[PDB]
Structures are given as structure tokens and as C-alpha cells.
């Protein structure tokens, strides 16, 4: 319908990002529990990202996959926009990592499997996330991982330009077939996560922003002793400077270390 605020009972904050203030909510007629992600219009306008929010809604709302958070709808008033999200009751992977410091191999491999299933669904539909990180990985009621926060995602086949439908005559194949953007970006992220999950720190961590930038551009990481051979092999394959040398998701899902340790298919 055209949902509005008065259709919901509001509960506690679930989390805060740079932009979203997310609240537990209950729809009044159904008593169905969900999450409201609230954004300030003034802040969206000041940062120049109103377009991104539009894309977050257009792209996420159409995805259907158990490892991807549903977005059900939206509404707005004079000062705010409200996104109606599936409620993830077990929090963020970020918070679980604060709690446990580091994950064992079985938990890590299980998370990587679920993330790779979600990203293969996305990438097969030309959706690229571009913001994979622990705070945007939520946990459902059986502890299964759910990708969320499609703020920076892209989907060339539904892009503004594609919809304008200009002449193709001067455009290369990569652009006309909605292949303009590189999905390998998400594969790097997956490697960063797998390392961080096992080690408790991301591979390119440093004091300053400048030192961090250097570490990443040079791919300067090392492994602690306890990281096993199989885990080193997978991380090393994902963290390639050259995007085209990073593996297909099918190779992540079938990696021997993954298949030996993952509890999920």
C-alpha cells in the first residue's frame, strides 16, 4: 500500500550507520515484527547521495534469496525516509566478532559459504554490492548470514542510463550488455572477511588512513602461525591485486577448506 508511520508500533534501536537509524517495529494489524531504517532527507541531500538511496530501494526490493535481507517497501514524510526491512533478530557479524574475538574454522567457513551463495545470486543478475563488511552482515533466527545495506550497489540493466535508452552505436560491448561494472570487487571483500573472521583483525589494518591505503594497494598482509594451509590458500586466491585473477564464486564454494569445514551446502 502506501504505508505510513502510524501503521507501526516502534521499539528499541537495533543499530546506527552513518545514515540509517534502524528501529524495531511492529505492524499494527498483523503484529508482524520488522525493522525500520530511517534516513534524514537533509543529511542525504547534504552528502549528495539521494540517488544511492533510490538505487538501494530499487535493487534490494527485487532480490529473493535466503541469505539476502528483504526490503518490503518504503515511505517518507517531510524530514525522513523510512525503509521497511526484514528484521534480523541475532544482530550483526560485527557484534559477534566483538563478542568472540575470532571465529573457528567451521563458523568462518559456514559464513563464507552463505555469503558466496548470496553474492552468486547477486552477480548472476548483474547486482554488485560494493559495501560488504561485518556491520552489513546480519544474522537471522537460525544464525544464518544475511547481506544487507545495498546503499552502494549497482545494477547496470536497470540503471538511469539504460532506462534512457540512448543510441548504442558508440558504446563498447561491456556497456551495452550491462556488464559495465566489475563484480570482482566483492570477491576481494570476501577475502578480507575470511581473514578477519579467523584472525580477529582485517589483513590491511594500520593506525592511520594513509598507512592503510598503502597496505591495501601493495597487498601487504601476512598470516599468523595458527592460520591453516587451506585457509591461507583461499585467502591468498581472493586477495589478488589484479581483479581478473580473483576466483569465481564457484571455486570459493567448492574450495576443499570450505567443504571440509562448512556446515551449510
Which positions make up the binding site? 18, 37, 86-88, 135-136, 149
Residue 219 interacts with which of Mg ion, a second copy, ligand ADP, none, CB < 5 to 8 Å by class:
a second copy
Site for ligand ADP in 35-74 (CB under 6 A): 35, 37, 69
Contact partners, residue 216, CB within 8 Å, separation at least 6: 204
Vertex 2, ends 34 and 140: CA angle to 5°? 15
Select from 10, 100, 176, 260 the one that contacts a second copy (CB under 8 A). 176
Phi, psi (deg, nearest 5) at residue 67: -105, 20
Three-state DSSP class for residue 170: coil
- For position 45 contacting a second copy by CB under 8 A, the verdict is no
Active-site residue 186, yes or no?
no
Q: Which of Mg ion, a second copy, ligand ADP, none does 48 bind, CB closer than 5 to 8 A by kind?
A: a second copy
Calculate the CA 146 to chain-centre distance. 8
CA gap 25, 85 in Å, rounded: 10
The CB-of-212 to a second copy minimum distance in angstroms stands at 5
Q: Which stretch binds Mg ion (CB under 5 A): 17-25, 69-77, 169-177, 200-208?
A: 17-25
For residues 123 and 119, give the distance between their C-alpha atoms in angstroms, rounded to a whole number. 6
Task: Rule CB under 8 A: say whether 217 interacts with a second copy.
Answer: yes
Here's the x/- map for a second copy, 132-151, by CB under 8 A: it reads as xx------------------
To the nearest whole angstrom, how small is the minimum distance from the Cβ of residue 57 to Mg ion?
Answer: 12
Query: Of residues 169, 225, 226, 263, which one binds a second copy by CB under 8 A?
Result: 169
- Choose, from 7, 77, 104, 131, the residue flagged as catalytic: 131
User: Which segments of the chain does DSSP mark as H helices, in order?
Assistant: 41-47, 50-60, 93-100, 105-124, 160-164, 173-176, 184-199, 209-217, 229-238, 249-253, 256-261
Binding positions for Mg ion, rule: CB under 5 A = 17, 136, 149, 151
What amino acid positions are annotated as catalytic residues?
131
Amino acid at each position: 500500500r502506501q504505508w505510513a508511520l502510524e501503521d507501526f508500533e516502534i521499539g528499541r534501536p537495533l543499530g546506527k550507520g552513518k545514515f540509517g537509524n534502524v528501529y524495531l517495529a511492529r505492524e499494527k494489524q498483523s503484529k508482524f515484527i520488522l525493522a525500520l531504517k530511517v534516513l534524514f532527507k537533509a543529511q542525504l541531500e547534504k552528502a549528495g547521495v539521494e540517488h544511492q538511496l533510490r538505487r538501494e530501494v530499487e535493487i534490494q526490493s527485487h532480490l529473493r534469496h535466503p541469505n539476502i535481507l528483504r526490503l518490503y517497501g518504503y515511505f517518507h514524510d517531510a524530514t525522513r525516509v523510512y525503509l521497511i526491512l526484514e528484521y534480523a533478530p541475532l544482530g550483526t557479524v560485527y557484534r559477534e566478532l566483538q563478542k568472540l574475538s575470532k571465529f573457528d574454522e567451521q563458523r568462518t567457513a559456514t559464513y563464507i559459504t552463505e555469503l558466496a551463495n548470496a553474492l552468486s545470486y547477486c552477480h548472476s543478475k548483474r547486482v554488485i554490492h560494493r559495501d560488504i563488511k561485518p556491520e552489513n552482515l546480519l544474522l537471522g533466527s537460525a544464525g544464518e548470514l544475511k547481506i544487507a545495506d545495498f546503499g552502494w550497489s549497482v545494477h547496470a540493466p536497470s540503471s538511469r542510463r539504460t532506462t534512457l535508452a540512448g543510441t548504442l552505436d558508440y558504446l563498447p560491448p561491456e556497456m551495452i550488455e550491462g556488464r559495465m561494472h566489475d563484480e570482482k570487487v566483492d570477491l576481494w571483500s570476501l577475502g578480507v572477511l575470511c581473514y578477519e573472521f579467523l584472525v580477529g583483525k582485517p589483513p590491511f589494518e594500520a593506525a592511520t588512513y594513509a598507512e592503510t591505503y598503502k597496505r591495501i594497494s601493495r597487498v601487504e598482509f601476512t598470516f599468523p602461525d595458527f592460520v591453516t594451509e587451506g585457509a591461507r590458500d583461499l585467502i591468498s586466491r581472493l586477495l589478488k591485486h589484479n581483479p581478473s585473477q580473483r576466483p569465481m564464486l564457484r571455486e570459493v564454494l567448492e574450495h576443499p577448506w570450505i567443504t571440509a569445514n562448512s556446515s551449510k551446502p
